[PDB]
Amino acid sequence: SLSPLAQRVVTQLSVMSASRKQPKLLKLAREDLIKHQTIEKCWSIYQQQQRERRNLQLELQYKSIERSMNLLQELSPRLFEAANASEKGKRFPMEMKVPTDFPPNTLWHYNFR
Amino acid sequence: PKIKVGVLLSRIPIIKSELNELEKKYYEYQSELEKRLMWTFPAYFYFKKGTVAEHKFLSLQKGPISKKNGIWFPRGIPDIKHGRERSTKQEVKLVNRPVIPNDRITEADRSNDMKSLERQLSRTLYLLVKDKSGTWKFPNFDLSDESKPLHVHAENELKLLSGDQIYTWSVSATPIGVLQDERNRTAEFIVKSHILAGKFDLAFEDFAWLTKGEISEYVPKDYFNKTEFLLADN
Amino acid sequence: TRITLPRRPAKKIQLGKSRPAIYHQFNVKMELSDGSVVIRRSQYPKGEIRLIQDQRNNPLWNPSRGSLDRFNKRYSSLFSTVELSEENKKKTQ
Amino acid sequence: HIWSDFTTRPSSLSIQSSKVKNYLFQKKASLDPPSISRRSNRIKYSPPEHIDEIFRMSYDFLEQRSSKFYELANKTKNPLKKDALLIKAEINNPEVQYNFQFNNKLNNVKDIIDYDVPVYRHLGKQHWESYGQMLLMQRLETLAAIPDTLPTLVPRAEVNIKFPFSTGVNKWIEPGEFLSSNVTSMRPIFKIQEYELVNVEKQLYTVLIVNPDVPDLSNDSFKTALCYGLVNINLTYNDNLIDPRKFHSSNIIADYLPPVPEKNAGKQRFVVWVFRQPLIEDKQGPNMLEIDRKELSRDDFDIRQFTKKYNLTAIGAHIWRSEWDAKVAAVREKYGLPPGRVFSRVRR
Amino acid sequence: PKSACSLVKPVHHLVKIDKSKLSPRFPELKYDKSDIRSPGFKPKDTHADRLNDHYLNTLQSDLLLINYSHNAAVVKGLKQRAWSGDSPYHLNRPPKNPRGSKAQLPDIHPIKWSNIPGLESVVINCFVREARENQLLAITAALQLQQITGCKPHPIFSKNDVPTWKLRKGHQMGAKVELKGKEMSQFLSTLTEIVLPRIREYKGISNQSGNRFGGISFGLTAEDIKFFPEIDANQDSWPKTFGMHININTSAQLDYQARTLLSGFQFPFFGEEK
RNA sequence: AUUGAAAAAAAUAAUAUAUAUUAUAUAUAUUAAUUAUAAAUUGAAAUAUGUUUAAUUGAAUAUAUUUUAGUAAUAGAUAAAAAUAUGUACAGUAAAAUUGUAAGGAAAACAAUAAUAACUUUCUC
């Protein structure tokens, strides 16, 4: 009927498939449904607020940069030129790592190079 | 007007941000909803039948109550496939050493040492400095030469202050903002830069590494208003 | 010639009744090369893993911070620089 | 805690069921849902875990938001803006959501869903837009009741009709239905549910049922026929069922003549239109209007011309459509209309 | 059929009739997939995404600061050129195609607080070419992909036919999977930390790699896939293993911006940039 | 309905039952199912009845009665790989060329490549 390789392929396929592995549908009572809706809506609102806060902050930073660069242009042309360069190949430093869940054994390195 | 060089050193957080009380609970609920809706664990794949590893897994597990004729099941009749109650959430209990994570709060945090870099791990720390007067501020430097670029000059000044303990990285040549005033006809162009690996430790009397919330307490109100948005909240 | 698994009649998923594939996943703790632990959701059943070769001990990811090995092991008593100076006459080439 | 206060706020924003309210607001998931009436089913049921504390937090968050909105709402002077503020404050209230979703909107009981309350009215409008309004629009376009009678419609009020007096059975007419001559023998009953903010005391309405498809053999085309015409009707958000109780004999510009389609004349559209009166300033009370009853004719009726004359704006519409059956002759006889014509089966 | 003449009739109202809502056929389908009442419901925001949080906090501000060019105006792309009306044959003529390209190119905007570059989507294309012989290899590749991602793969089929390579048309050959949001972020984090350090001699992603507009890519050999922890935990379960292409799609205007963004997430870049 | 936990009711829709009308309506009750379907001397689980250990429950083990495992793809109204070529209903848009990417090369696969003025809703200064 089937080889051992064929069997193992079928098993692998099954791992991915939804055939006889999935539970019943999540039914709720009307009160429960409402509670869920209120949880979700509030959360969504909170997320929107956070986005606006961050977005606003970014806008403020941009405005400050603009204000700075105009001033620099007014005062010292050479300094302005130096500031406003193409940073095409700018690379973030490899020490600035993505913050983990829990910290390492040695928290901070005081010596380098 | 005199050109001056503001510098704020940003030590970035080394671990995840702490979740809000609202957030945590919501996340737990979503996890429990997922679990309820999650598929059966296909144990037949990961554990081969008639093997020592499977047997241990089986022992760890406890099976579901099957339907049996002539009995009342007041929580409905058991719906079972691959050995799981379809009507409910499934729980699957699982050098050779237990992975024990380190404490997120630190010794420095406990002591409240403001000069230390390990004192807050989930927040963005900013280098502040106290001058001859009682005021605090971000490191200022006089730009008399005006030959070199501004950010490079700032970095050099920081390095000089340190005695080559600090290891910084400028984010860009562009200045983030300016602090300006009429009494002293000057202009402090603020550079942004990131402490990567070193001490500071040292004209300025004292220094500290603080979050955005603590800087408000230390620094003046007008100054804070000028430079609030530059600092990250977390 | 072509090796295949021949298909059975497909099961009709009705419109609206299609359900998203939520695979069974465990919360797995990865301890990296150093003691920094990180939680990640994973399909394989293992609550804890500790890694040997990661970015946190690779030189490319932190610049600021086995025939040769075999040779070192089995010529260890001799201790094999001074040795280079001894065995490097540059007349003959 | 603004949503627990009912000093200034209406009673309708609360849930009237006590058990349901208790279930909503508890400190642990101990109680079982009032919705599940049966004991065995309650036993079987299991709500999702951790739902209570998070729900409470969400309530607090949205309650705070509502309170903040109310701080603005009371300072506001202009009425539409104030209403919008009120809506914003209370729309995310769980109790009002429960009330609206799970109780009837058509024959709303005032204590549960009060359409005097702005939030509930907004909810009702949204519900109407979701399905019933779209359906009505489709039936107007497909059947060709818009361009044939009255150019366009901008649906504002939800209009539902009924024929209670003829047969006995209770049924709201779905737009574009085929009704028997027995069903539509006696007059219908309207319900004009208004969702916009409008002056309830001043605003009058007119209702016109028009039959565009009565055949005119001189023209070799069709003509309109005003089958039923009411004017100067007073509506209120909750008190809105236009019945012989409400309107007087003075309000009837053309009293109900029934659908009596001729044999082979075809299917005849009867499309009720609901207009609101023009509102005059510097005049307290409801501004009436006089209709020249000799000028307007029933056997031929320019609806558009009539609208132009009295400065009406069509807010709502509904439509049924009748064709010939055995009982139309009986209906004619009852009303004292003539025998009724019979046309050739072929449209030659 | 009396005719094939398609001709949509105009309407006499501005209300937008959603035809799906007027039916009673698919009541479960009227609910949004986000709604709990739909069978298509899935808990989306299950836990706090770590890479995304990092981007929000540290990187995004830094990226904005980098990308500020003073009084930078919009650079319009290559577009379809109109004809000068110096002849009456230009009058209903289709426009001249773009200058260099046949297809039109997008406008490059200055980076401000709104349009900062960020990760948009990851796609993991695995086309196993031995599966022209063996269909079961495609299945195994799909499983591997699923294991790696925690996301449902979609089967790739042979779209073309060719004799030199023993390839038919309409044959299942490997699989793909578009990751988005939190799963994608996790996959990137795993790539940065676990897998790409265990490749022995890897300098980086090439600087000559990428789209012209905010898309960067690279590929992993069958040797490299054995470092993924789901694969890594058991060598025995996976005798065979298949390479893969990894298309990273950013919200970057240009490719150097996208490269910079990826560097922020600890991706090393080695080659000489364009 | 009995069982668990610690007076009632007020949508839609479905189901059950009843009746109203030359009206596929209304009334009351209740919220099921939702990816399954025969056939397994062999795997796994439960319950019942025994026996032994630390009246007791856990733990171990025997028999009986069941339940699961036949492990197989679409999970989306799918949308230019291949497949039902006539009906109807609903919805969408192709191709080429270009820039890239593990074996991949001119030629296998995947990604990306025209413009947002005005409008509606949401959050926010």
Side-chain angles (χ1 to χ4, degrees), chain C residues 2 5 12 26-27 30 37-38 44-45 52 56-57 59-60 69 71 76 80:
Chain C
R2 176 162 161 74
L5 180 66
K12 185 187 291 298
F26 310 94
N27 284 32
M30 311 297 292
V37 180
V38 63
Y44 193 87
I52 314 306
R56 221 64 55 90
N57 76 346
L60 180 55
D69 183 44
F71 181 95
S76 187
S80 302

Coordinates of all heavy atoms in Angstrom, one line a residue, chain C residues 2 5 12 26-27 30 37-38 44-45 52 56-57 59-60 69 71 76 80 91 93, unseen atoms left out:
Chain C
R2 N 7.5 9.7 -11.8 CA 7.3 10.7 -10.9 C 6.7 10.2 -9.6 O 5.5 9.7 -9.6 CB 6.4 11.9 -11.4 CG 6.1 13.0 -10.4 CD 5.7 14.3 -11.1 NE 5.0 15.1 -10.2 CZ 5.5 15.9 -9.2 NH1 6.9 15.9 -9.0 NH2 4.8 16.7 -8.5
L5 N 2.0 11.3 -4.0 CA 1.0 10.8 -3.1 C -0.4 11.2 -3.7 O -0.7 12.4 -3.9 CB 1.1 11.5 -1.7 CG 0.0 11.2 -0.6 CD1 0.2 9.8 -0.2 CD2 0.2 12.1 0.6
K12 N -15.0 19.7 1.5 CA -15.6 21.0 1.2 C -15.7 21.9 2.4 O -16.5 21.7 3.3 CB -17.0 20.8 0.6 CG -17.6 22.1 0.1 CD -19.1 21.9 -0.4 CE -19.2 21.1 -1.6 NZ -18.6 21.7 -2.8
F26 N 4.2 26.0 22.2 CA 4.7 26.1 23.6 C 5.5 27.3 23.7 O 6.2 27.7 22.8 CB 5.6 24.9 24.0 CG 4.9 23.5 23.6 CD1 5.2 22.9 22.4 CD2 4.1 22.9 24.5 CE1 4.6 21.7 22.1 CE2 3.5 21.7 24.2 CZ 3.8 21.1 23.0
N27 N 5.5 28.0 24.9 CA 6.4 29.1 25.3 C 7.7 28.5 25.7 O 7.9 27.8 26.7 CB 5.8 29.9 26.4 CG 4.7 30.9 25.9 OD1 4.0 30.5 25.0 ND2 4.6 32.0 26.5
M30 N 14.8 30.4 25.5 CA 16.1 30.3 24.9 C 17.1 31.0 25.8 O 17.0 32.3 25.8 CB 16.2 30.8 23.5 CG 15.1 30.3 22.6 SD 15.1 28.6 22.2 CE 16.6 28.4 21.3
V37 N 18.2 35.3 28.8 CA 17.1 34.4 28.4 C 16.1 35.2 27.6 O 15.9 36.4 27.8 CB 16.4 33.8 29.7 CG1 15.3 32.9 29.2 CG2 17.4 33.0 30.5
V38 N 15.6 34.5 26.6 CA 14.5 35.1 25.8 C 13.4 34.1 25.5 O 13.7 32.9 25.2 CB 15.1 35.7 24.4 CG1 15.7 34.6 23.6 CG2 14.0 36.4 23.7
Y44 N 7.8 22.7 18.6 CA 8.5 21.6 19.2 C 8.4 21.6 20.7 O 8.5 22.6 21.3 CB 10.0 21.5 18.8 CG 10.7 20.2 19.1 CD1 10.7 19.2 18.2 CD2 11.3 20.0 20.3 CE1 11.3 18.0 18.4 CE2 12.0 18.8 20.6 CZ 12.0 17.8 19.7 OH 12.6 16.6 19.9
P45 N 8.1 20.4 21.3 CA 7.9 20.4 22.8 C 9.2 20.4 23.6 O 9.7 19.3 23.9 CB 7.1 19.1 23.0 CG 7.6 18.2 21.9 CD 7.9 19.1 20.7
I52 N 24.8 27.4 22.3 CA 26.2 27.4 22.4 C 26.8 28.5 21.5 O 27.5 29.4 21.9 CB 26.9 26.0 22.0 CG1 26.1 24.9 22.7 CG2 28.3 26.0 22.4 CD1 26.0 25.0 24.2
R56 N 25.5 36.5 20.4 CA 26.1 37.0 21.6 C 27.5 36.5 21.9 O 28.1 37.0 22.9 CB 25.1 36.9 22.8 CG 25.0 38.0 23.7 CD 24.4 39.3 23.1 NE 23.1 39.1 22.4 CZ 21.9 39.2 23.0 NH1 21.8 39.6 24.3 NH2 20.8 39.0 22.3
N57 N 28.0 35.5 21.2 CA 29.4 35.1 21.3 C 30.1 35.0 19.9 O 31.3 34.6 19.8 CB 29.6 33.7 22.0 CG 29.1 32.5 21.2 OD1 28.5 32.6 20.2 ND2 29.5 31.3 21.7
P59 N 32.0 37.0 16.8 CA 32.8 38.3 16.7 C 32.2 39.3 15.7 O 32.4 40.5 15.9 CB 34.2 37.8 16.1 CG 33.9 36.5 15.4 CD 32.8 35.9 16.3
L60 N 31.5 38.8 14.7 CA 30.8 39.7 13.7 C 29.7 40.6 14.4 O 29.6 41.8 14.1 CB 30.2 39.0 12.5 CG 29.4 39.7 11.5 CD1 30.3 40.8 10.8 CD2 29.0 38.8 10.4
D69 N 43.2 22.5 16.3 CA 42.8 22.1 17.7 C 43.4 20.7 18.0 O 44.0 20.5 19.1 CB 41.3 22.1 17.9 CG 40.9 21.7 19.3 OD1 41.5 22.2 20.3 OD2 40.0 20.9 19.5
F71 N 45.9 19.2 16.4 CA 47.4 19.3 16.4 C 47.8 19.8 17.8 O 48.8 19.3 18.4 CB 47.8 20.3 15.3 CG 49.3 20.5 15.2 CD1 50.0 19.8 14.3 CD2 49.9 21.5 16.1 CE1 51.4 20.0 14.2 CE2 51.3 21.7 16.0 CZ 52.0 20.9 15.1
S76 N 51.1 18.7 22.7 CA 50.9 19.6 23.8 C 52.1 19.5 24.8 O 52.5 20.5 25.4 CB 49.6 19.2 24.6 OG 49.4 20.2 25.6
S80 N 55.1 23.2 21.2 CA 55.5 23.7 19.9 C 56.9 24.3 20.0 O 57.8 23.8 20.7 CB 54.5 24.6 19.3 OG 53.3 24.0 19.2
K91 N 67.8 31.9 4.3 CA 68.8 31.9 3.2 C 68.3 31.0 2.0 O 68.3 31.5 0.9 CB 70.1 31.3 3.7
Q93 N 65.6 29.3 -0.3 CA 64.3 29.6 -0.8 C 64.1 29.2 -2.2 O 64.9 29.5 -3.1 CB 63.9 31.1 -0.6

